[PDB]
Each structure stands twice: as structure tokens, then as C-alpha cells.
Amino acid sequence: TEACVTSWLWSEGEGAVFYRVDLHFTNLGTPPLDEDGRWDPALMYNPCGPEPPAHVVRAYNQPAGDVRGVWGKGERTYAEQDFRVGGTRWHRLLRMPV
């Protein structure tokens, strides 16, 4: 059972990039578990692919904490995080709920 939400992300400087990210959320209900009751999905299931470039993925999946701006209006509002990853500055807009 499916849901989705969209992010945006872009870097600065020479060779700057700009991506849309559609996060497709799938509810797996109650999957099979081991003893104790632990799930090990990274090893159980096949990942999607082919992968985007390495540095783009590291940047999107970076922790960054400091919400530094709020974009958009009304019901479609986005939190901006602003961070560097090895000399490259990134901006990442995340949908923020109510």
C-alpha cells in the first residue's frame, strides 16, 4: 500500500546540480521476522536501481539539522536545510506536515 511525498535538492558552484526526489513509501504490513523479532531488510530485499551519482545520494541522505528557511505557502510548505558536504554547499527542501 502506497504513499508518496516530494523533495528538492540542489548544490552550488561549478557543476551545480538540481534534483527532484519522489519518496515512494510502501507499507509492508507485518513482514516475516527472525528470533527475538528483528527485521533485516537490507539483506532480505532487493534495492531499486540503477543508482543516482554517489555524491548526490550522500548529500540527500546527509544529516543536517538546522532548518534555515520555510518555503511555499498554505498547505504545500517546505523546510529548507542548508549544509556543506566537503566544500560543496547543498540546499534540500523537505515537505513538512501539520
Next chain:
Amino acid sequence: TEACVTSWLWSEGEGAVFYRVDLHFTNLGTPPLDEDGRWDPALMYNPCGPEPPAHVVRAYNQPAGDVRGVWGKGERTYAEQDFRVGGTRWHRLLRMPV
């Protein structure tokens, strides 16, 4: 349909839920503010839906340190987080390539 990575997110306790998240990446070219300075209409345009429930989204984006790194079908590296938010304990896996 272009470039893709996978994440995993799950909770413990009664009402535990389990989710696969596929992150679809679409290269949009140059960062959205040009030197003129006009905006790319692609930015925040046509967000996907419907959106996942608020506690799920919040959990997915909660700041949390990496507990450990794991593999990963095909020796693919993931960062793991183990954290609590809203009284609920969550586990999270994020694709993190080098």
C-alpha cells in the same frame, strides 16, 4: 524510472509499522535560480501524492546519529539509526555509498 535508491524505516512496540521507501531521482539540470534571475518552474511543482501519515514522515526525517554502518545486498553500504521520537522507537536505514 531514471535513478533510484532504497531506504527502510520501522518502529517497535504495539502498532509497529514497517516501510520500504524508494527514492526516485530526476535530474532537473541547473539549480533553480538563474543569473537573470528567473526561477525554474520545476521547483516545488506538482508534488506527488497522497502523502504518508504525519508521524511516519516525521520519523523518516528525524535527526539522529548513525549507530553503525551495514551491508546491504551486493555489498551496498547503509548507515543505521536507532532513535526515539513521540514515545516510539524507530529504526532507519539510509543508502550511504563511498
